Design a protein around this ligand. Structure first.
Ligand SMILES: *[C@@H]1O[C@H](CO)[C@@H](O[C@@H]2O[C@H](CO)[C@@H](O[C@H]3O[C@H](CO)[C@@H](O[C@@H]4O[C@H](CO)[C@@H](O[C@@H]5O[C@H](CO)[C@@H](O)[C@H](O)[C@@H]5O)[C@H](O)[C@@H]4O)[C@H](O)[C@@H]3O)[C@H](O)[C@H]2NC(C)=O)[C@H](O)[C@H]1NC(C)=O
Ligand SMILES: *[C@@H]1O[C@H](CO)[C@@H](O[C@H]2O[C@H](CO)[C@@H](O[C@H]3O[C@H](CO[C@@H]4O[C@H](CO)[C@@H](O)[C@H](O)[C@@H]4O)[C@@H](O)[C@H](O)[C@@H]3O)[C@H](O)[C@H]2NC(C)=O)[C@H](O)[C@H]1NC(C)=O
Ligand SMILES: *[C@@H]1O[C@H](CO)[C@@H](O[C@@H]2O[C@H](CO)[C@@H](O)[C@H](O)[C@H]2NC(C)=O)[C@H](O)[C@H]1NC(C)=O
Ligand SMILES: Nc1ncnc2c1ncn2[C@@H]1O[C@H](CO)[C@@H](O)[C@H]1O
Ligand SMILES: [Fe+3]
Ligand SMILES: [Zn+2]
Ligand SMILES: [Zn+2]
Length: 341
């Protein structure tokens, strides 16, 4: 009857997907690709049905005619009465984080310092910070601003990949999937924590989830929040508790995309799947939890409370908002109607 094919990016997501596939009685199955771009192509071809994406990729996917189905929703103070599935999403804060110990480093002295990015083309790790850097720089030269970086998905042999480490044994350097040690929110923050870079571009949640005992990963277990600072755009430095006054931008939540002709079908099965393995699901802690992967953010961010319905039936532009959509257009003149494929 109603069977959905999920697209996993890399071997670790593949493994989580296989687990979810087993436990769902094959109501969901898995396709695997090496990168997000490749997963998008599988969906266009019709060989995969769906995957969850950061806003940067929702933009790529959108030009290709894919559509947002459901969005990640995390815990909230305000909007509290409403059920998670119906509650509007709040977005996330993209911030630039540094070590307190690295004094006199401000937004205005980042020139030729070392940077850690989640990946190329992602919202907090790339589009926002580079969008800003290009704009206040006049130059589309973003690859020469930092002396060295880890920016997964850039040319392996460039300075933008210099700080990337690859895997266990040094392979897959700078691949934009979790084989790369410094990939994604967790990896970029690890890049800073281990003093590989001077600055990481992540979101506010990442700092709080890998400090003060929240993570039990060994590179993060001794980390303290007071040891970091946020860099604000006004040239000041603030404690991490101040993200609401010291952020680069507010980002649209990650969301599930699918081909438009499959949207309804994909929506139905996942609402059912989340009842079963979601945050309150018939079986989260006993058999399987869709929203956990021990801080690795596999398939979905681990802080996800549920996947929310989008009311207003957004096109991908409305979903990303005009604000962010122009930020991307502008950045992309550097490196108007298209679809990468
Ligand atoms: C940056 O990111 C970090 C990490 O995401 C954010 O911090 C996280 O924020 C969440 C919620 O925003 C926080 O949740 C904890 O909060 C309390 C602590 O015990 C727990 O339960 C509480 O429950 C009650 C009711 O459910 C409620 O209090 C009530 O408030 C009303 C009205 O104000 C009042 O009448 C009474 O006082 C009520 O009791 C609270 O809302 C609260 O939820 C939660 O279950 C949970 O433990 C996370 O702990 C926190 N994450 C971490 C790891 O620290 C941060 O907000 C982001 N900042 C910015 C700037 O956006
Ligand atoms: C890099 O550099 C460019 C240079 O501007 C910048 O591009 C864009 O900057 C503006 C921000 O989006 C954009 O202005 C448009 O937005 C206007 C706002 O709409 C108004 O809001 C009110 C408030 O509630 C509403 O009532 C109502 O919707 C109202 O219209 C809108 O009026 C117009 O569409 C404006 O054009 C500007 O057009 C755009 N400029 C260019 C060159 O495209 C990028 O954002 C910069 N990049 C980064 C990362 O900052
Ligand atoms: C796989 O598909 C369906 C999703 O609803 C589930 O089986 C359904 O169970 C209900 C109630 O017993 C029936 O009304 C449906 O008709 C059943 N589906 C069909 C068409 O056979 C089943 O739970 C799902 N598997 C899991 C574990 O996710
Ligand atoms: N509190 C907020 N302030 C400003 N913009 C927001 C906020 N919440 C969500 N957004 C934006 O709404 C857009 C989706 O309509 C997203 O791009 C997101 O950036
Ligand atoms: Fe993101
Ligand atoms: Zn703001
Ligand atoms: Zn509309």
């Amino acid at each position: 009857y109603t069977r959905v094919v999920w697209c996993a990016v890399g071997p670790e997501e593949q493994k989580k997907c296989q687990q979810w596939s087993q436990q769902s009685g094959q109501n969901v199955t898995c396709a695997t690709a090496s990168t997000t771009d490749d997963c998008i192509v599988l969906v266009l071809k019709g060989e995969a049905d769906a995957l969850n994406l950061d806003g940067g990729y929702i933009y790529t996917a959108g030009k290709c005619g894919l559509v947002p189905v459901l969005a990640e929703n995390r815990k909230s103070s305000k909007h509290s009465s409403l059920d998670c599935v119906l509650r509007p999403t709040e977005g996330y804060l993209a911030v630039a984080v540094v070590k307190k110990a690295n004094e006199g480093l401000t937004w205005n002295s980042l020139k030729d310092k070392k940077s850690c990015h989640t990946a190329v083309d992602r919202t907090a790790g790339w589009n926002i910070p580079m969008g800003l850097i290009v704009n206040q720089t006049g130059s589309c030269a973003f690859d020469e601003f930092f002396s060295q970086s880890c920016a997964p998905g850039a040319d392996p042999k460039s300075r933008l990949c210099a700080l990337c480490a690859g895997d266990d044994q040094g392979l897959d350097k700078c691949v934009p999937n979790s084989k790369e040690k410094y990939y994604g929110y967790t990896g970029a923050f690890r890049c800073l924590a281990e003093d590989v870079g001077d600055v990481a571009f992540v979101k506010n949640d990442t700092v709080w989830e890998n400090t003060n005992g929240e993570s039990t990963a060994d590179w993060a277990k001794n980390l303290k929040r007071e040891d970091f600072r946020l860099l604000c755009l006004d040239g000041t430095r603030k404690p991490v508790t101040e993200a609401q006054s010291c952020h680069l931008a507010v980002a649209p939540n990650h969301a599930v995309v699918s081909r438009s002709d499959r949207a309804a079908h994909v929506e139905q099965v996942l609402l059912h799947q989340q009842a079963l393995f979601g945050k309150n699901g018939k079986n989260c802690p006993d058999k399987f939890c869709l929203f956990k992967s021990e801080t690795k953010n596999l398939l979905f961010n681990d802080n996800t409370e549920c996947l929310a319905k989008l009311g207003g039936r957004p096109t991908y532009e409305e979903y990303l908002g005009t604000e962010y959509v122009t930020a991307i257009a502008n950045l992309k003149k550097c490196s108007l109607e298209a679809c990468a494929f």
